[PDB]
Every structure is written in C-alpha cells, then in structure tokens.
C-alpha cells in the first residue's frame, strides 16, 4: 500500500496563472511508466488519466488544460497542473489515485480559492487615505490663504481625479482599472507637489518641498515596481512616499496658520 506526503489543502489567487495540486508518493518502486497508472478524480468524476503502458493522457472537455509531468512520475511526483480558468470553476476535494504492479494508493487534497485583490487590505486602505488627507489639507491652506483662480482651477480637478483615481482603484482583482486608478492617484499627488509650492521663501519651505519631492519620486519609482504584475511585494515605498507627502502638506497647513496671524 502506497504512502504520500500528506497535504491538507492549497490556496490559489487571481494571479496564479498555472495551478498545481501536489501528490507525492514516498515509497514508489516502479522502474518504468509502463508499470504505472494515475487517475485524478474531482467530485466523483475521472478528470485526468495517465496510462503508463500506452502513455495516453486523457481528460474531459471540462479540464482540457490538465496535465502531470510524466518526467517526474517515477520519482513519486504525480502532481496535477491546470490553467487558472479551469481551476477557478472547480474548487473542491481532488483525489489522486496512483497504481503500480502490486501496490496502489490514493490521497485527497482540497483546492481552496481566496481573493486579496491586488494589494492586501491594509496596503490599499493606506495609499487611498494619505493622498486624500493630503489634498483635504491643501484645501485648508487654499481656504485660509484665499480668506489666484489658477490654484482653485487646478484645485477642483485634483480632488476630482483623486475621487476618480481612488474609485477606479479598489474594485476588482488587479485590473488596468486599478493600475490606472493608482496612476491617476500618484499623478494627482504629482501635481499636488506643484500646487503646494504655489503659495508666495522661508528656510521652512525649501525643506518641506525638497523632502516632498524626494518622497514623491520615491513614491513614483516606488510604483514603477508595483504596476507590473499582481501580488507586488513592493508596497511600503508607495505608502511611505505618500506618507511624507501627506505630512509635508501637514507642515504646510499649520506653518501658514502661524503666518496668517502673526504679521
């Protein structure tokens, strides 16, 4: 009786192009595929069969993409490979049956699906609130500084394309909807960098401005990483830049609150 590397379950995400269900025989004794037969079952159906003797791989029309790597079979690797589109529609308890000459075995692996669309909950709740707090704050400096047209001209549009950017981004599972949403966001914050240095200098402006630029191109070259492919493990840079730009804006609001008061 064959034994396995017992595996409870596996999780796949929207960005898992190719899906792999593990099946490892620990005590395989075969010396040619002729001796071997593998049957993959799902929900009481035979969804993949490899006959070693004829090396005939046979699959239903509903799993046309399914395969195992023959090469690795004799080593104990009877793991199943399928494309994303087939897997998504078929989440459940997969069964692997492997048969030699005089010994057989089977094992069960549950296929689970989870959605964490593009960024992790905490990450995609940051890069939305920092460049909303930021402009909300700019409005305070604009309102206090008024009581240019230009600044208010380019002021409404910034709030609009953050409100647009930050609802284009956050739906779905890593679209070009999101990709563009976030781009509109970083470019909005990227004309905010200009609309914050549109006051008029102290020794306090050249600071907040230069560090705002630093953190900004850190946040753009901090996004040039991320825009490419789902599950980008390059989030902290994008959040930190927008952090310093939020905070620079914060120095902005209150240092001017000091001026417009004290001669």
């Amino acid at each position, epitope marked *: 009786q064959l034994l396995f590397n017992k595996t409870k379950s596996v999780e796949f995400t929207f960005c898992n192009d190719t899906v792999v269900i593990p099946c490892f025989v620990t005590n395989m*004794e*075969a*010396q*040619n595929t*002729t*001796e*071997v*037969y593998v*049957k993959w079952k799902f929900k009481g159906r035979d969804i993949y069969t490899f*006959d*070693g*003797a004829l090396n005939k791989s046979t699959v239903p029309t509903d799993f046309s993409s399914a395969k195992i790597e023959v090469s690795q079979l004799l080593k104990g690797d009877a793991s199943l490979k399928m494309d994303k589109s087939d897997a998504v529609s078929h989440t459940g308890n997969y069964t692997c*049956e492997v*048969t*030699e*000459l*005089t*010994r*057989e075995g089977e094992t069960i692996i549950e296929l689970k699906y989870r959605v964490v669309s593009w960024f992790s909950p905490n990450e995609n709740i940051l890069i939305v609130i920092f460049p909303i707090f930021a402009i909300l704050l700019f409005w305070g400096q604009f309102g206090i500084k008024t009581l240019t047209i230009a600044l208010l001209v380019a002021g409404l549009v910034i709030t609009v394309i953050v409100i647009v950017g930050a609802i284009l981004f956050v739906p779905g599972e890593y679209s070009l909807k999101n990709a563009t949403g976030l781009g509109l966001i970083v470019t909005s914050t990227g004309i905010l960098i200009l609309l914050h240095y549109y006051v008029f200098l102290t020794s306090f402006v050249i600071a907040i401005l230069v560090i705002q630029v630093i953190a900004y191109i850190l946040a753009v070259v901090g996004l040039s990483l991320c825009i490419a492919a789902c599950i980008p493990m390059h989030g902290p840079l994008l959040i930190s830049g927008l952090s310093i730009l939020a905070l620079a804006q914060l120095l902005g609001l209150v240092y001017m609150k000091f001026v417009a008061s004290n001669q």
Partner: antibody
Framework: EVKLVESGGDLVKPGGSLKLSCAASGFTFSGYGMSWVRQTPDKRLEWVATITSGGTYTYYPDSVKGRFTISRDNAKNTLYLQIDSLKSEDTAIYFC???????????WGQGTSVTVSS | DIVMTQSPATLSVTPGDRVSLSCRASQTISDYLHWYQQKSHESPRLLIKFASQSISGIPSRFSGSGSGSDFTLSINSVEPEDVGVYYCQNGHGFPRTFGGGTKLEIKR
C-alpha cells in the same frame, strides 16, 4: 509481434527444485514488468510472482510461503522463476506474462508443465 | 486476501446472441478490473483492462462495464470462435486474484 516462451517444466520428486526460463522477443524486455502465473489442473489461475522492469523489486502472494524466487537477465532477454521445496500442490502449467499497471498481463506464453509426483 | 467470484459457472449461448458475464469482488476496487479469455489448447489473452478499456486487436463485440464491486463482460453477438473460459482479475487489492472462471459453451 510479441512472443513469450517458457521452458524447464518437468516431472520432479516432491521436495525437489526446478528453474523455469522465459524467453522474451518483440519488445523492449527491460522496459516492462513481468509476472509468473500458474494454472492448476482444476483450470483455476493463480498469480505466483511479479518483478519490476529493473529487476530491483519483486512481489509474491503469501500462498507459496516464499518458495518461488523470480529474476530477470535484461541482457539475454530472459525472465526466470526458481521454484524450490516443490509440493504436490504445485503441479500446474506455468505462464510468464508481460505486466502493465494493476498487473494487467497483456501477453502470455504458451505454458510449461510442472508435475510433482512420488 | 480479497475473493473474486464469477457468475455464471457455465453457460450455453446461440451464436449471434448477446451474453453478460458477472464478476464480484469482496471489496471496492474502483474500475481496476481486467478480463481475459482462454480457448482450450491456448493460453489466456487480455480482452479488457481497467473495467472498460478495450485492447488492440480484440473484436469490437467485447466490452467491459461496472465499477466498485460488481462488473460485467458483455459479448454483443457471440461467435462459435468465442467458445472458451473467461476470467476476471482484480487490479486493486492484494493479491492479484483471478476469478473462478466462466465456461462459455456454444449451442448449435
């Protein structure tokens, strides 16, 4: 096609020993698992032995109390079965057979006759 | 030490007739069940493997069915050449047990 040829069957005294040879022809001998199956004169069929393609691993039923020893000379295209401590109960026809998974035997030989009498 | 039981023991059929031979296992063996025939003065030849899979050069009239415990070898339009003995053999469980055998006599 494929052709399998057993020889070495004979009359033997009880307790004696016989070595059976099986000549394989018309396929990659060293590519396939092989087996021994006997057929009692009551015309029932009993699997007695099985060897992997590589000759490394062997398999037997508990029925024949470890008296049978299978081997294969992959160079000479010859499968062998050593039957020892023969009993009256071993009198049968011995078939070699090419074995697939689930020990599906898709080629059988013509048979060789073992008889064990006093 | 699984037990394979075939049924019937013996059988007389008129050529051009359909016939069902049964095979029963003493435990679940999925679709891992093989069928051979033996014409007297010949050795066994494989008809079916894995319950249902037909072999190269087997007449189109044999096919196997069933799964789990109960199995059926069907001969749709038997011929006077098909006179012989039919054996089922379990592909799963230990050991590789054969069935008792079904003798098929032809009527004329």
């Amino acid at each position: 096609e494929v052709k399998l040829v057993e020889s070495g069957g004979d009359l033997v005294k009880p307790g004696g020993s016989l070595k059976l040879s099986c000549a394989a022809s018309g396929f990659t001998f060293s590519g396939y698992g092989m087996s021994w199956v006997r057929q009692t004169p009551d015309k029932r069929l009993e699997w007695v032995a099985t060897i992997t393609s590589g000759g490394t691993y062997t398999y037997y039923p508990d029925s024949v109390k470890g008296r049978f020893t299978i081997s294969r000379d992959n160079a000479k295209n010859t499968l062998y079965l050593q039957i020892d401590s023969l009993k009256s109960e071993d009198t049968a026809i011995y078939f070699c057979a090419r074995s697939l998974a689930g020990n599906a035997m898709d080629y059988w030989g013509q048979g060789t006759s073992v008889t064990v009498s006093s | 030490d699984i037990v394979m039981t075939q049924s019937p023991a013996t059988l007389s059929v008129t050529p051009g007739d359909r016939v069902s031979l049964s095979c029963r296992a003493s435990q679940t063996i999925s679709d891992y069940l093989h069928w051979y025939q033996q014409k007297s003065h010949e050795s066994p030849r494989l008809l079916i493997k894995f319950a249902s899979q037909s072999i190269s050069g087997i007449p189109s009239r044999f096919s196997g069915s069933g799964s789990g415990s109960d199995f059926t070898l069907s001969i749709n339009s038997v011929e006077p050449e098909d006179v012989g003995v039919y054996y089922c053999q379990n592909g799963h469980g230990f050991p590789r047990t054969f069935g008792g055998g079904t003798k098929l006599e032809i009527k004329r």
